[PDB]
């Protein structure tokens, strides 16, 4: 029984849910960001597609309820399922999050502000011009669609993370 | 220091092929390279091949092509090295080492021994 | 293909010693755009797979001993080893990750005099 919530209807139109078949999604004649607030809970009803979240690896979370045990009906019955919430994977679980509002367009989370990005690492973003690149990187993230991925490897509190990073070079 | 587990020691009769396996353990394979390196009875070591599991791309060495092809199945986070018609030279180990942008073999298998003989 | 020759081929040291094997290349590991030398040295020790020792040419690889340096620039490179110990015998393998396809050198294997 898998766990993952969609309430997906793009009221302005968007055409965002027309960008998870693609050969066609590859539209962003309008480009012309990180800063956020911290992790707290989301709860179904906002959310729509997977709930990406950045260990150095990326990683999605899965429906749960006030407690840790999961749902298991695709996020729906007050559905307080997301826990984004902790400090840095050195001590915590992750550094950041990223998933898609139902509005069309979503917005980041990350760690309290200030390698460096261990120490000043919030989103997916390790530079000001590099992010982690995950499956749905291009629907989160339209605008770096031209950005150039590359292979790196980064240590964190003792594990070695493997990692593709796109940039803008 | 990723951890990446190879197949056994393979006897191969002259003229057979082999398939060699290296299974990776603990990240996904699509964030590395995956090269294949070659060390024959008391010689030095040899770079035959890297393959890009995220799009198949595949180098070779000029000296190995028709002799070693790659592969790799994001599936099973496994890469291979397919050897056709063994001859006595090709006796030797066979590592598979993963690598970042900077094509450093920063992490090798444990090896596999291949013993061509009738 | 770019050759890399090593000097010496057998080395011997007391332990708690200084102890330089040197690596030269046929052509310049130098990058223009990264005044980076691609260049990579790896520990073999008996019966078992190669290690990263360093990368970059001086770029230590995270967990391996302080001890170990990596030198040099453009065709000339050396490993160090500030102090060897009982436990680093072995055969040392320099090897460019420069251009395809990547070669090594012969390499230096290393003995303790006791």
């Known amino acids: 029984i898998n766990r993952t919530a969609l309430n997906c209807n793009d009221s302005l139109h968007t055409g965002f849910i027309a960008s998870l078949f693609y050969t066609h999604s590859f539209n962003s004649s309008g480009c012309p960001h990180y800063p956020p607030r911290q992790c707290g809970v989301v709860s179904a009803k906002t959310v729509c597609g997977p709930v990406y979240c950045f260990t150095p690896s990326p990683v999605v979370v899965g429906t749960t309820d006030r407690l840790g045990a999961p749902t298991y009906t695709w996020g729906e019955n007050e559905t307080d399922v997301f826990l984004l919430n902790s400090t840095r994977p050195p001590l915590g679980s992750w550094f950041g999050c990223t998933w898609m509002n139902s509005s069309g367009y979503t917005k980041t989370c990350g760690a309290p502000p200030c390698t460096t990005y261990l120490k000043c690492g919030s989103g997916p973003w390790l530079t000001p011009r590099c992010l982690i690149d995950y499956p749905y990187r291009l629907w989160h993230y339209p605008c770096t669609v031209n950005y150039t991925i590359f292979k790196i490897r980064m240590y964190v509190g003792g594990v070695e993370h493997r990692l593709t990073a796109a940039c803008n070079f | 220091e990723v951890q990446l587990q190879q197949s056994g020691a393979e006897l191969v009769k002259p003229g057979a092929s082999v398939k060699l396996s290296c299974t990776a353990s603990?990240?996904?394979?699509?964030?590395?390279?995956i090269h294949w390196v070659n060390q024959r009875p008391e010689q030095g070591l040899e770079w035959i091949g890297r393959?890009?599991?995220?799009?198949?791309?595949?180098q070779y060495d000029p000296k190995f092509q028709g002799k070693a092809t790659i592969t790799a199945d994001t599936s099973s986070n496994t890469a291979y090295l397919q050897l056709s018609s063994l001859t006595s030279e090709d006796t030797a180990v066979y590592y598979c080492?993963?690598?970042?942008?900077?094509?450093?073999?920063?992490?090798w298998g444990q090896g596999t021994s291949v013993t061509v003989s009738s | 293909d770019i050759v890399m020759t090593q000097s010496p081929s057998s080395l011997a040291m007391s332990v708690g010693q200084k102890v330089t094997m040197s690596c030269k290349s046929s052509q310049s590991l130098l990058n223009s755009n990264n005044q980076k030398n691609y260049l990579a040295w790896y520990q073999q020790k008996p019966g078992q797979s190669p290690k990263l020792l360093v990368y970059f040419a001086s770029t230590r690889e995270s967990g391996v001993p302080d001890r170990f340096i990596g030198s040099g620039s453009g065709t000339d490179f050396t490993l160090t080893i500030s102090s060897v110990q009982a436990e680093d015998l072995a055969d040392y393998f320099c090897q460019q990750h420069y251009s395809t396809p990547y070669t090594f050198g012969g390499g230096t294997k290393l003995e303790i005099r006791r």
């Open positions: 393959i890009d599991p995220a799009n198949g791309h595949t």
């Open positions: 080492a993963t690598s970042d942008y900077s094509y450093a073999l920063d992490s």
């Open positions: 603990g990240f996904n394979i699509k964030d590395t390279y």
